[PDB]
Amino acid sequence: SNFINIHVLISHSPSCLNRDDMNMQKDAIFGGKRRVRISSQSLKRAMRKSGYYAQNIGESSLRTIHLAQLRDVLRQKLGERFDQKIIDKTLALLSGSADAVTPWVVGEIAWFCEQVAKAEADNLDDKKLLKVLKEDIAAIRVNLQQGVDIALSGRMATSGMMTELGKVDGAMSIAHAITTHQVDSDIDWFTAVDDLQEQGSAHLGTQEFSSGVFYRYANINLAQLQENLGGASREQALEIATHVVHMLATEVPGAKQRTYAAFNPADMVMVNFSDMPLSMANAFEKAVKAKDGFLQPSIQAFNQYWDRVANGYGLNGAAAQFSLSDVDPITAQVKQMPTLEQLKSWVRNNG
Amino acid sequence: SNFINIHVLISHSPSCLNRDDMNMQKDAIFGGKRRVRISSQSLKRAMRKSGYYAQNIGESSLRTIHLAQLRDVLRQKLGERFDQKIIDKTLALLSGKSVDEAEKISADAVTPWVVGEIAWFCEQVAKAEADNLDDKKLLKVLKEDIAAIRVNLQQGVDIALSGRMATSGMMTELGKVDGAMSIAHAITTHQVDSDIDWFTAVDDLQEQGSAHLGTQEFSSGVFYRYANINLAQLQENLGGASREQALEIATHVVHMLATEVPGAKQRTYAAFNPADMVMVNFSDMPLSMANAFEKAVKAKDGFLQPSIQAFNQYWDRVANGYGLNGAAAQFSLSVKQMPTLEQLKSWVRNNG
Amino acid sequence: SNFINIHVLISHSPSCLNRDDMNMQKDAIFGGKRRVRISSQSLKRAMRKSGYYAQNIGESSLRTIHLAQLRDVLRQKLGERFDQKIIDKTLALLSGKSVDEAEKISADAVTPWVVGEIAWFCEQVAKAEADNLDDKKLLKVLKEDIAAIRVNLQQGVDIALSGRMATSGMMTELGKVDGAMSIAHAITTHQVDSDIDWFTAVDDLQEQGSAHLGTQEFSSGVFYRYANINLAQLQENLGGASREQALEIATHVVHMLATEVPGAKQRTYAAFNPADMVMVNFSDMPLSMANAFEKAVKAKDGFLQPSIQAFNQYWDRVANGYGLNGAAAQFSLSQVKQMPTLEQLKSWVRNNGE
Amino acid sequence: DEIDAMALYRAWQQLDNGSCAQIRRVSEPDELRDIPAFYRLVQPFGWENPRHQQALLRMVFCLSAGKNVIRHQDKKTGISLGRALANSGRINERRIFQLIRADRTADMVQLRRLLTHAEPVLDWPLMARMLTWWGKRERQQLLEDFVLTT
Amino acid sequence: DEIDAMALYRAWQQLDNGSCAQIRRVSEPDELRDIPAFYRLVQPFGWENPRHQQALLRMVFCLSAGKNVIRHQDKGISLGRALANSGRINERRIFQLIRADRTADMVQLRRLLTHAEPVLDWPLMARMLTWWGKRERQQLLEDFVLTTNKN
RNA sequence: AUAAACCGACGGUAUUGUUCAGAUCCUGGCUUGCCAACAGGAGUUCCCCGCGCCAGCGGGG
DNA sequence: GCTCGATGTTTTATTTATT
DNA sequence: CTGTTGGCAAGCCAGGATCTGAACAATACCGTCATCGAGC
């Protein structure tokens, strides 16, 4: 299959992990009922800026892209629109035996080739060209040393990219996190006591906060990941996928965490392969009612939903489920995992 | 490891340690059930104002919005070290507010101040105007080295642990501190239906009946305190302290989190209970155990035993599942077995 | 040390020592199980109104919200020392209320007053009058020395122990007091299912049936009273008294907490039981042993023996666990100095725990 | 389908001294399940049907405050409970806050205490509808009526 | 993990006259722990499991009022509705059951059964006897009072 | 590869101090648990063994 | 390559109910 | 080897009143338009 589906159930203690311009908890109406929400961008940032990400994705081995090795395939690809003089001049001034090439690299380099061609036509060179294109070159260089970050998460907010081909979507897609149950949020009426004020406090306020059993969903386009890694292998893509699983299972937005401290890990992590990526959010369309907590009924509802619809929805294919609870499991079609690591290794070996 | 995780299970006899706008107990919905709550700000202020904190860590910062009263205080304290003018201008530079002789001068918001930090600052201001250096360039120069100012935060550790922001004045650029620690609201491990006390106030000049009839919410509870110290950040916020100093501070935080209880209604409910269970754990990234109590602890010869048991079970589930192997010591009383809190504290002092 | 902790285990024959607006026993859920409760305020009133208090400490405070009645009382008691004009003016300054000849003047809430304290204030107001000193300026200069006023609290110790709140008047600056003694609601160490007495009232002029039918909830119990005195605060509240005086007062508090029982329904249930177990523990930070009974003590040849058992055990666990090596002295009717008589325990407390 | 609240009101009103005395000494709504007189009172008003059970527990508690504490007074919507509590002029606003913020069973106790204090004159079937539902909306409405009236 | 009530009912109704006669002879439920025929009866119903065994003590003690006393019907009629339907029991006696202490409650229940000879749904009553506690006493009183007052 | 792509709403904060629910009160009068009854019937006990009149007696289990 | 500072423009609507 | 049956389970009458339900002080700030040319 081409897609990796990652499903996570994770329970948070009383906190406020994502708010709006009125400092109110982000929410969403699902199944006619209010669910507390953690926005996709907040979750994905929580991943992308994390230390784990920086160590395993940021400092990856396929990180650096060498323009040297890319000379030939570039030479043909752009060879139809540009001639080898301009191509090699461009490549050499940028840098100062590869099979395929990442599309955004081809695009940006092609733009640079347009620029140097138009630079030769007008009759110009030297520090003139190298001052007009100083910032641009700096940009493309910094990006050329961040290939895995760009392949997985997409180009940064301020990238320097200049072509339609340089609009790099991430390989991973992260849905908004929503609670599996209805939530009426709590209010914290707080005071700020002045050490110089005898009567009363110096400030008064309220803070909205709530517990919640969240359902995170994310999927990974393997093909696109390989292709954006310069034609890497399925296995390397599966390593990256392993990392994504880990982060989606452990990483939590730092919003309001200094004071509410909801540092909780996932109680359930499932991964399955498919040709069509699907969210199991409809397992909670009818809001989960609490029976000795919201966690167990949530996992149970997830399992029952999968058992009901997985066959018809064409979700046949490799599927593993790491879990901390002892709730009745899924169909036997899903391979049970006792540690997260065994699940990640299950992912490494193509399922 | 960079993170010190402090877990506390503490039982309180009937009391009311934290209430809201309508004098009712603070609570929180967890796992579909109501838990009594002690807010984190209450815990932090209870700690920073404690005798233990005063004896072992130092002076708590001075949090205020009243800049005039502050002006007067600083004048009274930094008077024999600086001339009044310099003190005034320094306050006026840090706050962004004009400090004259007004009866009432108000800052942008309640802000924590460290007297020593202010002293250092007005040293800098003195040496600034003496060298004919205007205020903007002074801001640049001071912006070039923030560690010193953070050693001035060594004189106000609660700001190094809990943080500080300012929206106006040079503080905006220089006093921006991200808290080192991190702490959760204390919630009970079980469902609570709070009791109500129907009381009367008897008048000694009124033979017939009472002079006041009223109600007061209260309850018993087995609270779960959690607090991890970030450590590298504690070193940064203290101006570049050693890991030993940060570890010792963390130790004091363990002792306080284990023993300190807000004074709310304690002169009439007196729930002076120490923690029955305390556990400290070193880890690469923070880990809270609140999901041990997501399913509310059902009573069984008390709420405390099943709470501790549930805590241990979930701890093992998490450690086995995520393969966590950071050093850990538990002190129990009902991973380590700590006959005494002191052994656990020394164990923490010694990097685990 | 600074903190004198006082633990009491006391058993009551079937009774009803504290009830609510429905004549039901006051309770409290602890360790997931119902405990019959005796509120702190009831213990405190039972103590300050007790004969032992009067004979050993002095006159309790005068707690009232009626400033008219108080006006009259003060006019009578201080009339031989002050002009009615400055007595009225004083009360009006302290209360933040206008005192004229109205039959009904009400304060903000029920307030503790000491006649000697108000007399002191009268001396001050009189002097200010004689010096044409602004009322505001008088408030200012008086605010610059709370100690004397607290000596006037020596004349009303129950305030010094349990504190005073103010919302209007000069009191809001001068009369705020932090209670030295902290005390908890007495709760049963065990679970209690309270019984019901279904009573009648026989009309001597009625042959067929009784004149009244009713029910009254009652129960027996083993209560854990806890109360630590803060001490330095007790010296401050008494105007800078000595440690010895504070120790005498603390000793008296021990005696009362071991002997005084609320008068409620004692005329028809008579649960006049003295405390079987009393441990005063000298110490450095307030410590409550209530968690010894978090797990409800279960009956085994009584609730008393298993309760004293559980208490002693948990006391040990905590003592060595947190390294509490303050003094620690106990007295019982069945490292911790044991006393045969209560009086030896009291004498022990008076001597700073030696 | 809907509980005849006035019929329950008159029923409670002409109840013998004994049964009444037995229902009155209850200290929380669920305890009404221990009193036979209660069942005999609410049986004709649909008690053997659960929804009605909860509603009737609340209603009969509020009535158990006493025979002469809730004065029904016909419509000229009709005097709502909040309006009535304010009209008494005895109830502090803070107590109304503490009532509408309270949780299950506690809310009914506090309400009965309020009713005992105010001795409100109100449209009883109206309050009966309110007690039937008693969601968060109803409690907020209680508070806001009380405020607007003062 | 529930005791098959109907199976126990059938087991009792089919039991030899001698053994059941030996069982009826008992005066209070605990004494049943001294009769062999008892164990012989409650053995295929998990007497080995303690909770089950207290439940079984009560159930058998009620079944030992007679053998034709409790006419098991089938939808269901509760014990309260049945004792009320007999018309032979006055409310004060039901109170004398639900207020009775340990063991004595069972005796009073046995006498009530002998007296009323109720037609009821047995498994329901079995569930009641299993969780014999404040809720079942309450619902018993409820059913009795309601059924009585309807007549 | 969709008004898409790339994409945090962020940082600081005790709700505080004061308070008996209290006085009065039989659950009470009447009531056999009572009549019939032998604990008797019935030698299966599966082996090894020693001595016989072959009927049956013993020691080791 | 910036940070600086003066500067283009323009706002106000209400005021007692009852699922 | 064998363990029983009938007949019977009550009524009267009674549940209270007094009086009381608090006050004060405090509810933040920043940024998420642009221009130009100048000084640095």
mmCIF file of C-alpha atoms in Angstrom, chain B residues 100-288:
data_model
loop_
_atom_site.group_PDB
_atom_site.id
_atom_site.type_symbol
_atom_site.label_atom_id
_atom_site.label_comp_id
_atom_site.label_asym_id
_atom_site.label_seq_id
_atom_site.Cartn_x
_atom_site.Cartn_y
_atom_site.Cartn_z
ATOM 1 C CA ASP B 100 7.436 61.243 39.890
ATOM 2 C CA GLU B 101 5.863 61.962 43.285
ATOM 3 C CA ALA B 102 2.269 61.000 42.459
ATOM 4 C CA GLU B 103 0.155 59.349 45.140
ATOM 5 C CA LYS B 104 -0.822 56.605 42.697
ATOM 6 C CA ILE B 105 1.277 55.292 39.810
ATOM 7 C CA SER B 106 0.022 52.110 38.164
ATOM 8 C CA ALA B 107 1.971 49.651 36.013
ATOM 9 C CA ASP B 108 0.599 47.779 33.001
ATOM 10 C CA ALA B 109 -0.133 44.670 35.063
ATOM 11 C CA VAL B 110 0.897 42.840 38.219
ATOM 12 C CA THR B 111 4.601 42.155 37.794
ATOM 13 C CA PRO B 112 7.208 40.329 39.917
ATOM 14 C CA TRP B 113 10.267 42.362 40.928
ATOM 15 C CA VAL B 114 13.552 41.357 42.529
ATOM 16 C CA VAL B 115 15.089 44.094 44.677
ATOM 17 C CA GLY B 116 18.626 42.888 43.982
ATOM 18 C CA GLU B 117 17.944 42.795 40.247
ATOM 19 C CA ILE B 118 16.770 46.393 40.472
ATOM 20 C CA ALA B 119 19.947 47.298 42.379
ATOM 21 C CA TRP B 120 22.124 45.801 39.641
ATOM 22 C CA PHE B 121 20.039 47.642 37.068
ATOM 23 C CA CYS B 122 20.453 51.048 38.703
ATOM 24 C CA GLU B 123 24.177 50.351 38.949
ATOM 25 C CA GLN B 124 24.035 50.012 35.177
ATOM 26 C CA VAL B 125 21.956 53.201 34.891
ATOM 27 C CA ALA B 126 24.435 55.131 37.036
ATOM 28 C CA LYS B 127 27.408 53.962 34.982
ATOM 29 C CA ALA B 128 25.317 54.714 31.886
ATOM 30 C CA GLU B 129 24.480 58.371 32.468
ATOM 31 C CA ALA B 130 27.926 58.903 33.989
ATOM 32 C CA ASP B 131 29.474 57.812 30.690
ATOM 33 C CA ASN B 132 26.937 60.009 28.893
ATOM 34 C CA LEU B 133 25.199 56.964 27.443
ATOM 35 C CA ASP B 134 21.551 57.572 26.561
ATOM 36 C CA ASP B 135 18.736 55.125 27.258
ATOM 37 C CA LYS B 136 18.375 53.447 23.844
ATOM 38 C CA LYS B 137 22.038 52.491 23.519
ATOM 39 C CA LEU B 138 21.925 51.345 27.140
ATOM 40 C CA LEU B 139 19.058 49.059 26.153
ATOM 41 C CA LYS B 140 21.166 47.640 23.315
ATOM 42 C CA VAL B 141 24.222 47.057 25.513
ATOM 43 C CA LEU B 142 22.155 45.386 28.224
ATOM 44 C CA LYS B 143 20.366 43.340 25.549
ATOM 45 C CA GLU B 144 23.775 41.961 24.600
ATOM 46 C CA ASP B 145 24.167 40.037 27.889
ATOM 47 C CA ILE B 146 21.175 38.688 29.802
ATOM 48 C CA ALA B 147 22.923 36.043 31.935
ATOM 49 C CA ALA B 148 24.033 38.604 34.535
ATOM 50 C CA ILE B 149 20.455 39.770 35.015
ATOM 51 C CA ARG B 150 19.554 36.120 35.513
ATOM 52 C CA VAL B 151 22.141 35.852 38.265
ATOM 53 C CA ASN B 152 20.107 38.684 39.699
ATOM 54 C CA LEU B 153 17.282 36.189 39.331
ATOM 55 C CA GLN B 154 19.371 33.950 41.604
ATOM 56 C CA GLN B 155 18.199 36.545 44.131
ATOM 57 C CA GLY B 156 14.591 35.748 43.189
ATOM 58 C CA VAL B 157 14.305 32.037 42.440
ATOM 59 C CA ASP B 158 10.492 31.846 42.291
ATOM 60 C CA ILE B 159 10.726 33.938 39.124
ATOM 61 C CA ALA B 160 13.306 31.472 37.813
ATOM 62 C CA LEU B 161 10.898 28.596 38.430
ATOM 63 C CA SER B 162 7.509 30.111 37.595
ATOM 64 C CA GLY B 163 8.347 32.747 34.987
ATOM 65 C CA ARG B 164 7.717 36.422 34.277
ATOM 66 C CA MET B 165 6.392 38.602 31.472
ATOM 67 C CA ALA B 166 6.117 42.341 30.947
ATOM 68 C CA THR B 167 4.401 44.309 28.198
ATOM 69 C CA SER B 168 5.924 47.707 28.906
ATOM 70 C CA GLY B 169 9.339 49.066 29.844
ATOM 71 C CA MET B 170 12.792 47.600 29.271
ATOM 72 C CA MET B 171 11.559 44.484 31.088
ATOM 73 C CA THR B 172 9.752 43.626 27.842
ATOM 74 C CA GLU B 173 13.190 42.993 26.361
ATOM 75 C CA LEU B 174 15.187 41.973 29.430
ATOM 76 C CA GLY B 175 12.833 40.404 31.960
ATOM 77 C CA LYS B 176 11.198 37.823 29.708
ATOM 78 C CA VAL B 177 11.595 34.619 31.718
ATOM 79 C CA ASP B 178 10.206 31.199 30.832
ATOM 80 C CA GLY B 179 9.622 29.160 34.016
ATOM 81 C CA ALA B 180 12.039 26.351 34.755
ATOM 82 C CA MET B 181 9.950 23.842 36.737
ATOM 83 C CA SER B 182 6.221 23.371 35.571
ATOM 84 C CA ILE B 183 3.244 22.380 37.766
ATOM 85 C CA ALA B 184 -0.274 20.877 37.516
ATOM 86 C CA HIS B 185 -3.443 21.630 39.477
ATOM 87 C CA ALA B 186 -3.988 19.212 42.351
ATOM 88 C CA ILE B 187 -7.015 17.064 41.544
ATOM 89 C CA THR B 188 -8.451 14.210 43.600
ATOM 90 C CA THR B 189 -7.979 10.630 42.431
ATOM 91 C CA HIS B 190 -11.627 9.938 43.227
ATOM 92 C CA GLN B 191 -15.060 11.468 42.659
ATOM 93 C CA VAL B 192 -16.123 13.958 45.319
ATOM 94 C CA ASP B 193 -19.561 15.121 46.361
ATOM 95 C CA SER B 194 -18.666 18.066 48.583
ATOM 96 C CA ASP B 195 -20.254 18.310 52.024
ATOM 97 C CA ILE B 196 -21.950 21.474 53.242
ATOM 98 C CA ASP B 197 -21.567 22.889 56.748
ATOM 99 C CA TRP B 198 -24.707 24.540 58.119
ATOM 100 C CA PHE B 199 -23.368 26.927 60.742
ATOM 101 C CA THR B 200 -24.699 29.646 63.012
ATOM 102 C CA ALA B 201 -23.194 32.732 64.616
ATOM 103 C CA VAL B 202 -24.552 33.174 68.129
ATOM 104 C CA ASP B 203 -25.050 36.749 69.325
ATOM 105 C CA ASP B 204 -24.345 37.470 72.992
ATOM 106 C CA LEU B 205 -26.922 40.275 72.993
ATOM 107 C CA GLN B 206 -29.632 38.250 71.276
ATOM 108 C CA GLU B 207 -31.385 35.656 73.427
ATOM 109 C CA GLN B 208 -33.665 34.440 70.646
ATOM 110 C CA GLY B 209 -31.974 32.335 67.984
ATOM 111 C CA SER B 210 -28.731 33.194 66.230
ATOM 112 C CA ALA B 211 -27.408 36.310 64.513
ATOM 113 C CA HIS B 212 -26.146 34.509 61.432
ATOM 114 C CA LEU B 213 -27.231 31.389 59.560
ATOM 115 C CA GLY B 214 -25.046 30.157 56.723
ATOM 116 C CA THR B 215 -23.522 27.351 54.676
ATOM 117 C CA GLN B 216 -19.895 26.469 53.897
ATOM 118 C CA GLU B 217 -18.695 23.958 51.304
ATOM 119 C CA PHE B 218 -15.944 21.524 52.343
ATOM 120 C CA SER B 219 -14.618 17.995 51.706
ATOM 121 C CA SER B 220 -11.960 15.351 52.340
ATOM 122 C CA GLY B 221 -9.606 14.310 49.569
ATOM 123 C CA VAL B 222 -6.726 12.302 48.166
ATOM 124 C CA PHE B 223 -5.025 14.807 45.899
ATOM 125 C CA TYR B 224 -2.529 14.121 43.148
ATOM 126 C CA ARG B 225 0.142 16.811 42.895
ATOM 127 C CA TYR B 226 2.410 16.738 39.868
ATOM 128 C CA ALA B 227 5.314 19.028 39.064
ATOM 129 C CA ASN B 228 8.349 18.595 36.875
ATOM 130 C CA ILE B 229 11.259 20.935 37.044
ATOM 131 C CA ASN B 230 12.902 21.821 33.830
ATOM 132 C CA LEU B 231 16.508 21.970 34.830
ATOM 133 C CA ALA B 232 18.665 23.301 31.961
ATOM 134 C CA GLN B 233 16.231 26.171 31.896
ATOM 135 C CA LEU B 234 16.677 26.571 35.652
ATOM 136 C CA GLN B 235 20.399 26.888 35.017
ATOM 137 C CA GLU B 236 19.804 29.481 32.308
ATOM 138 C CA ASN B 237 17.352 31.500 34.410
ATOM 139 C CA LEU B 238 19.860 31.659 37.261
ATOM 140 C CA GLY B 239 22.578 33.169 35.091
ATOM 141 C CA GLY B 240 24.357 29.925 34.312
ATOM 142 C CA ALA B 241 24.224 28.010 37.573
ATOM 143 C CA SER B 242 25.684 24.535 37.995
ATOM 144 C CA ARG B 243 23.614 21.364 37.816
ATOM 145 C CA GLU B 244 24.189 20.821 41.535
ATOM 146 C CA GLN B 245 22.442 24.071 42.465
ATOM 147 C CA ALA B 246 19.504 23.263 40.194
ATOM 148 C CA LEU B 247 19.315 19.777 41.709
ATOM 149 C CA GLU B 248 19.284 21.188 45.244
ATOM 150 C CA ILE B 249 16.550 23.665 44.348
ATOM 151 C CA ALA B 250 14.612 20.772 42.818
ATOM 152 C CA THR B 251 15.102 18.893 46.082
ATOM 153 C CA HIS B 252 13.571 21.794 48.000
ATOM 154 C CA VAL B 253 10.688 21.776 45.531
ATOM 155 C CA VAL B 254 10.227 18.079 46.323
ATOM 156 C CA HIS B 255 10.159 18.722 50.069
ATOM 157 C CA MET B 256 7.690 21.594 49.716
ATOM 158 C CA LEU B 257 5.441 19.839 47.209
ATOM 159 C CA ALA B 258 5.411 16.956 49.667
ATOM 160 C CA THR B 259 4.703 19.016 52.779
ATOM 161 C CA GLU B 260 3.240 22.451 51.939
ATOM 162 C CA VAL B 261 -0.532 22.928 51.999
ATOM 163 C CA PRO B 262 -2.412 26.208 51.310
ATOM 164 C CA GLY B 263 -3.582 27.960 54.479
ATOM 165 C CA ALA B 264 -7.141 28.427 53.246
ATOM 166 C CA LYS B 265 -9.698 27.748 55.999
ATOM 167 C CA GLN B 266 -7.051 25.872 57.993
ATOM 168 C CA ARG B 267 -7.726 27.883 61.139
ATOM 169 C CA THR B 268 -11.164 26.280 61.143
ATOM 170 C CA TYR B 269 -10.598 22.998 59.290
ATOM 171 C CA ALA B 270 -6.907 22.315 60.002
ATOM 172 C CA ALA B 271 -6.080 19.733 57.339
ATOM 173 C CA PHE B 272 -2.362 19.824 58.123
ATOM 174 C CA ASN B 273 -1.650 16.514 56.455
ATOM 175 C CA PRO B 274 1.735 15.502 55.041
ATOM 176 C CA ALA B 275 2.010 13.455 51.843
ATOM 177 C CA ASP B 276 1.524 9.758 52.423
ATOM 178 C CA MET B 277 3.350 8.976 49.180
ATOM 179 C CA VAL B 278 6.142 10.718 47.276
ATOM 180 C CA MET B 279 7.903 9.660 44.064
ATOM 181 C CA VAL B 280 10.636 11.381 42.054
ATOM 182 C CA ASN B 281 11.810 10.246 38.617
ATOM 183 C CA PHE B 282 14.431 11.456 36.136
ATOM 184 C CA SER B 283 13.401 11.512 32.482
ATOM 185 C CA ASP B 284 14.212 12.759 28.962
ATOM 186 C CA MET B 285 10.777 14.309 28.492
ATOM 187 C CA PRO B 286 8.014 15.150 31.006
ATOM 188 C CA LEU B 287 5.592 12.464 32.171
ATOM 189 C CA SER B 288 2.478 12.951 34.283
#
